[PDB]
Amino acid sequence: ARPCIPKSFGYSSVVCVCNATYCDSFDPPTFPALGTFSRYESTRSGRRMELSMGPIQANHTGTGLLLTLQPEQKFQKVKGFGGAMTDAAALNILALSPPAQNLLLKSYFSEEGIGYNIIRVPMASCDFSIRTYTYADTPDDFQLHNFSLPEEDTKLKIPLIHRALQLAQRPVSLLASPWTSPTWLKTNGAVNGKGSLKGQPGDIYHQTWARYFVKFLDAYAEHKLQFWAVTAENEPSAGLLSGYPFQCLGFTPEHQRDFIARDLGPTLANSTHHNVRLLMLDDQRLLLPHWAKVVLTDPEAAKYVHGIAVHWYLDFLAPAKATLGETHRLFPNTMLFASEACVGSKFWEQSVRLGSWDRGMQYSHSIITNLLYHVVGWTDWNLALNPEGGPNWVRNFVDSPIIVDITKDTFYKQPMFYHLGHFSKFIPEGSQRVGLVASQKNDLDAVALMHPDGSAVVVVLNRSSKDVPLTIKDPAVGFLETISPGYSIHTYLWRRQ
Template sequence: MVCVCNATYCDTLDPVVLPAPGTFVKYESSKAGKRLERSEGSFQRSLRAPDLVLTVDTTQRYQKIKGFGGSVTDSAAINILSLPEKAQDHLLRSYFSEEGLEYNLVRIPMASCDFSLHAYTYDDVPYDYELTHFSLRDEDTKLKIPILHRASAMAKRPLSLYASPWTSPAWMKTSESFIGKGTLKGQAGDKYHKTWANYFVRFLDEYAKHNLTFWAVTAENEPSAGLINNYPFQCLGFTAEQQRDFIARDLGPALANSSHRHVQLIILDDNRLHLPHWAKVVLEDEQAARYVHGIGIHWYLDFIGPIQDTVVPTHELFPDYFILATEACIGAHFWERDVILGCWERGNQYSHSILTNLNHFVAGWTDWNLALDLEGGPNWVKNYVDSPVIVDSSEGVFYKQPMFYHMGHFSKFIPEGSQRVGLVASKESKKTDLEYSAFVRPDGAVVVVVLNRSLQNVTFGLADTGRPHRGRGSGQLHPDLPVAAAVTGLRCPWLARGWTEAVGLQPHTAHALRPGRCGRGGAVLCPVAEASTRVRWDPERCARAGGSGTPKAGILQAAECWCCCSNIKC
């Protein structure tokens, strides 16, 4: 099933509104046809717990989230601009606006890649070591840059742009060619390496003239590709040692001494099976490591590079460097069909990959082309693949595929600055086909994403007590997750921060409150109780805060400092 959009119609999503205290909002997509369908409900205290209960533990904190997005290649821009102007707007809004998925990451190839109409760089004049002939191409000024400006204008969240080069000019390479096996001529510190480093700076300079600044650059797209004989499209080979030396002696200093010193540098940008070796070679060198901020990974060989053997040890060795999934698409392998319109399983593959990465310290996930045509191109070497959005320019329409909606379960609800938190399955059902992850947003709301790829419906409970081993006082929802479905849930901010209640008091008259305003409905400041596993009742302080009365029997099981004020309506 696909959703069809044209110049006059396109499905939209409402901006996210946080639920009231004690309630949740659920967004569900399913093979049966639901597409981020919204529903609301209340956490209940009297339901019999199902066999599987997922308990949010906000005291367990993991990596911060950078975000989610896709890539503006030449081909993506060509396809978007092939539509009528209003349909173009619908497509871009679908990705970037509050009415859509709210992408915040955008990857841009530095010059051409395979998803271009031809191979080119920004300075193909031989031996121009001063880069006097460096200039952006029509693909930048007429395609990618206008798209980026329009996307930025539609987005409420700031966009983080990052750029990746596929190849240097051929005259800098040992192969004298854009394709095939080849590295930079010479060695780190020489004129070829200095010129290539300055090429990055010139790229950033030229885009800045168009009022576009970058969050990051990667040192090279898939540096291992340029070490393969007869590689079919643009590439530039580096070993880990060569990348280390290039960064330490050339690229790092060039960026640091430019007006773009704030731009972050990402190493690897290749399949994760190169980890942890690649990171150890580069980051154990002090001269290189001081210029590096993160590590980029691709998904194409995940089946021979388990995440526990690659990403996890890398994070353990280098916890101060973020890990970002920088490219993924389906259809790249010879055994995969290029475009399959409406394929739900491909959406499942996206969600499975994203959840696996997020649950193992990865800070975000970037899709490949934002849009392709019905063939999966254009691609100058016919390396066709699938995309979340497929454009049929002859009909003036585009199709939103299941992959698009699966991306939305993450990008729309887990903004930059969110943090992964604990989500523990009940002991009764440690073995489950569900995949899941939980996050606290910057606004304090908790987001839980659950994926069911099994062949049967799964009923589960979701509890949030702040202390997963103490269920008393928790609220639960008991959704039924259909076969082949993904669901994202939001909880209100202060309840999501480990809320607990005095046993015997009703939720609407007594709460364990975090210091601050009482939910949305009032402006009562609750005083801070003593830091203890038991929260002391202080009637004088509560009276000053606007509460009255005395508590009934029970213990507040608090993870932090709380107080209980009765008769405060939230």
């Protein structure tokens, strides 16, 4: 419906420029008739989710690359895709004019955008905050009579979440994660630094902390918001580290095991919020499978844990098979979920690289890797940042798919936005990953899924410089003759009878 307005900032590709009177958008979503496929294409050279259509053919000849769909080889069901409504994201979005705010939220949450259905909500402050606070800073309030939501929630985050829900046609799921407890519950009496809950699981400190989760859910429920899931702590490994610079709360895996078994599990299960899912870990993948082993081999903890949340710092290398793969092999009934991902966090790299195709490819390659290792969903970090990658009270700046420039009442949609959208827009909740078998060695990254209504979706990423002809075979339906251009990403969709 409206094309990308491209702008270059001297990186490898372009951003798309939106403002108070213009943003790129799609027509309302429709499928091609049976016998036709849809292709959405983005390229380093500047194409941004451009739609074209082609015939599904009865016949195929040639010794070229064939990707054969395995519709009956079924893997995980997909929860969805989204990002985080941090204080920084909320401040950046609301710093735009009301029209530009609307176009930004439509970009992420509407069917005229990329159809996000997950929002992660910090429980009080984190690094992507300008004020340090918890919901219960009054000391020694063990019954949490003075628990309350400040304006960061009631004036910024909650109204924006309500606006996102109004724009979405897909049901949206909220995920909550805490960084720190009130400091009077902590061994070090500070929001940051090395420190854990005082005492031991099953005591007043741990029971008060578990009750804070219920107070949080109660408070959001008064604002007519309900949660799909909570995590047991954002990055529990970080609070074990001397000098940790921002909000944290340290748990060893044994500590998290016992806290879930004795306090958090029982407290959530006894509340009106018993249907909220509990995700463990919420941390980097090299903690697996060890953390999963420690927690899930205790039946009293295991009975409360619905899933394992993992963080992806895309700037850094770590094994996928030995972490995610091995965890799925040992614990196939406990879903894996990616709860946070980001790029640009290395001090020596520019936090925000406007128009970086490389960072876009990092996003889509990560998502493909996650989906091929059984992960049910993928959640970006901050929904929007400023050109510095902030605000952030400890200057821990990073990149974001949307960058706001308040001085021009403008926002920029990064390659990362389109790379995420190649998945989020075209993979409804309840889709199932299926197999896809390559006929020969090749340089492409790809994943196939089946929609709840039986339709097919295939994403093909080409991180190489070479255009690669290929054929996609759907054994029931026929052949898609296509090309994967160098430095491109494509999403293919078709009906199946």
